[PDB]
């Protein structure tokens, strides 16, 4: 007979995740300010990491944290983000004190807990952006043309964040990021 697993084995997650950190410098290629921190594939290892890092709210504005599935870099150019998009959560100044941190953690839980049923396979990662003009949080998916999976994720996510239901959020494809001048950024889906 062997020993009992629940007693000593760690709680494995669906996928192994990687945490990346961005530091602005506005004097270096965007890619060069992007650095990997570490990875993990268990609930315990997740908390070990989370517990020893600054709360997004305490970071110097201009930085971002990013949690994506191992193998998927947190950038548009990636094979898995190229055709994708993101559900964006735009916060106001005040919300940096009341919601940023909790919102970001809930995002993290949705990611590692695979809280979107089979549609959690279309998820690439999430990223938090600390900015003085207003913070932002977003969940990236691989195919912005996959409305069924995209609308499902948006709903659950918005519901998991618990923000007032009357507040609508939009989903935008990375490929349409304005490139002209403002050119007006828009949404493929809304919930």
């Amino acid at each position: 007979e062997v020993a009992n697993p629940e007693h000593y084995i760690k709680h494995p997650l669906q996928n192994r995740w990687a945490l990346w950190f961005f530091k602005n410098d506005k004097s270096k290629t965007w890619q060069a300010n992007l650095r990997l921190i570490s990875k993990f594939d268990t609930v315990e290892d997740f908390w070990a990491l989370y517990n020893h890092i600054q709360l997004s709210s305490n970071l110097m504005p201009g930085c971002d944290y990013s949690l994506f599935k191992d193998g998927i870099e947190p950038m548009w150019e990636d094979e898995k983000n190229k055709r994708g998009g993101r559900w964006l959560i735009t916060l106001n100044k005040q919300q940096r004190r009341s919601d940023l941190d909790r919102f970001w953690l809930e995002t993290l839980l949705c990611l590692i807990g695979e809280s979107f049923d089979d549609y959690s396979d279309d998820v690439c990662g999430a990223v938090v952006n600390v900015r003085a003009k207003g913070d932002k949080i977003a969940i990236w998916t691989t195919e912005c043309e996959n409305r069924e999976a995209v609308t499902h994720i948006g709903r659950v996510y918005k519901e998991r964040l618990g923000l007032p239901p009357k507040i609508v959020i939009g989903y935008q494809s990375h490929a349409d990021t304005a490139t002209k001048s403002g050119s007006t950024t828009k949404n493929r889906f809304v919930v």
């Binding site: 709680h11 669906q14 989370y50 953690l105 809930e106 839980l109 807990g113 809280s115």
Partner: peptide, 20 residues
């Protein structure tokens, strides 16, 4: 179809303690 695989709910993850 697809495979089941690991799905954790809020409570459980939080239950595993850490940052409340």
């Amino acid at each position: 179809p697809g495979g089941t695989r690991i799905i954790y709910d809020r409570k459980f993850l939080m239950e595993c303690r850490n940052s409340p």
